């Protein structure tokens, strides 16, 4: 049902923004509900160092939880397993807001390339504010000269990079398109 | 900024040089020219005293006269006088005095009362677009009330 879509939900984040092996760690969580780290090390034949941070990416993004599988074997030795638990509802929390902010960020570069803010004297290697500007424009002048070069400036943050960001915005929506409603598909049940 | 955010030198407690608290005093284009020329009257009054032992022309022809009275290098003061005559729209000081008495009745902070006198508008909304200070401090209807009263007094001299 819905939780199965949550099972498949994290696959979207894992197989898109990460490498191929990252789902191989996630797949093992769905493979065994109590996923022993020592076993998952053997399953993909990756050493202790190579498998370590892979769980952390699933842990940090609220996708997995390495549950401290402390238990007492027959030998009475310090037995510990990083049981990669699947915290399904909390991983939803991580994917939900991460889609939220990135749409804003790509918008930000658009507005910045539509409102020139500063100036620059590329001859004297000096950038100017408009207030800096209004100090060296002469009443006999139409562009604010400099004080080290006594030369006009250039407008800063013009609109030649404006069109760059819209593709990033459009690529953001078209690539996050599979993810947005996949969260809302789960959020219908809120489980 | 223009939202009643003024520095220490422009607080309400303008201590006079006698050392006591007093209200901040601001001037609009309803008193500035009518006080400057008056003060110039005193200036020329002493200037000849100790020496013994429309509105447009009344502005500049007497501006040069007090340029004789003053040090004359203050032609930027003359620019201010010109700016006044072009955009200061009161006369017969009792006129503006009734205006100011009304604005004292308004219970408005002196900055706002100066805002009203300086500006010549038609509606409360025009004021709210120019004076974000004056948007709700009184009924917008009362804003238009006093704007219309000004328009009644809004006679070019």
């Amino acid at each position: 049902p819905i939780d199965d879509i949550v099972k498949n939900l994290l696959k979207f984040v894992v197989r898109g923004f990460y490498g191929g092996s990252f789902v191989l760690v996630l797949d093992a969580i769905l493979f065994h509900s109590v996923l022993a780290e020592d076993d998952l090390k053997q399953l993909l034949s990756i050493n202790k160092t190579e498998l370590g941070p892979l769980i952390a990416r699933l842990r940090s993004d609220r996708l997995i939880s390495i549950h401290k599988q402390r238990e007492y074997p027959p030998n009475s030795k310090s037995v510990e397993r990083v049981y990669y638990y699947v915290k399904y509802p909390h991983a939803i929390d991580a994917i939900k807001w991460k889609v939220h902010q990135v749409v804003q960020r790509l918008k930000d570069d658009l507005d910045k390339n539509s409102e020139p803010n500063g100036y620059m004297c590329p001859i004297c290697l000096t950038k100017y504010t408009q207030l800096e500007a209004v100090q060296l424009l002469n009443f006999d002048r139409t562009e604010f000269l400099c004080s080290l070069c006594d030369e006009p400036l250039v407008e800063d943050d013009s609109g030649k990079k404006n069109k760059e960001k819209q593709d990033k915005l459009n690529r953001l929506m078209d690539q996050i398109q599979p993810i947005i409603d996949s969260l809302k598909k789960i959020d219908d049940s809120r489980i | 900024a223009a939202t009643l955010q003024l520095g220490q030198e422009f607080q309400l407690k303008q201590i006079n040089h006698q050392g006591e608290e007093e209200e901040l005093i601001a001037l609009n284009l309803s008193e500035a020219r009518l006080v400057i020329k008056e003060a110039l009257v005193e200036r020329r009054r002493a200037f000849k005293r100790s020496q013994k032992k429309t509105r447009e022309k009344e502005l500049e022809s007497i501006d040069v006269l007090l340029e004789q009275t003053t040090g004359g290098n203050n032609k930027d003061l003359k620019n201010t006088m010109q700016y006044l005559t072009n955009f200061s729209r009161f006369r017969d000081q009792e006129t503006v005095g009734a205006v100011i008495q009304l604005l004292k009745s308004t219970g408005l902070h002196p900055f706002e009362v100066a805002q009203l006198g300086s500006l010549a508008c038609d509606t409360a909304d025009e004021a709210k677009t120019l004076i974000p200070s004056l948007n709700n401090k009184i009924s917008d209807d009362e804003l238009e009330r006093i704007l219309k009263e000004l328009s009644n007094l809004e006679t070019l001299y």
Partner: protein, 171 residues
């Protein structure tokens, strides 16, 4: 913006002027250097009221230079810009990216990004004016200028005006 202000000044009086008539030169210098001057702290000091009753209390002789130091308190009127404020004005000269509106004693500049898009610049025009969809705004044109930025530099205040908003451009 205009204000009646009570200002205090410290004036140095060189010894040669130590006549019985020191206050003469004193008030003289006061006027000669206060009326119509710019301060980063009070704005252009327009005119001084009560030329007679000025507190001139007592000199101090600097330990060297023997010049007396006087602390004059006096009451006058100043013109001070403020950000976001609405004023009238008139241009003086032109700029490729805006125009400098002489708001009375001071000149307020409006920049290219500070104007509405329909207000475009014509360099060919004489004087090169700024042409909106409805307004051609020239040197003597009356512009409703809104004070956006102000420079508080001592002796020199610079103001940033803009007509991008409504009720602006021609008054």
């Amino acid at each position: 913006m205009f204000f009646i202000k009570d200002l205090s000044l410290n004036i140095t009086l060189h010894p040669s002027f130590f006549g019985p008539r020191m206050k003469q030169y004193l008030k003289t210098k006061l006027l000669e250097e206060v009326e119509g001057s710019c301060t980063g702290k009070f704005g252009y000091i327009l005119c001084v009221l009560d030329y007679d009753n000025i507190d001139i209390q007592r000199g101090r002789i600097l330990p060297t230079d023997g010049s007396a130091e006087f602390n004059v308190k006096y009451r006058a009127v100043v013109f001070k810009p403020f950000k976001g404020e609405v004023v009238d004005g008139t241009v003086v000269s032109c700029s490729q990216h805006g125009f400098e509106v002489q708001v009375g004693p001071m000149k307020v500049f409006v920049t290219k990004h500070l104007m509405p898009q329909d207000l475009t610049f014509n360099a060919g025009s004489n004087p090169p004016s700024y042409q909106s969809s409805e307004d051609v705004i020239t040197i003597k044109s009356r512009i409703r200028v809104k004070i956006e930025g102000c420079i508080s530099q001592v002796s020199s205040i610079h103001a940033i005006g803009s007509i991008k908003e409504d009720y602006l451009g021609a008054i």
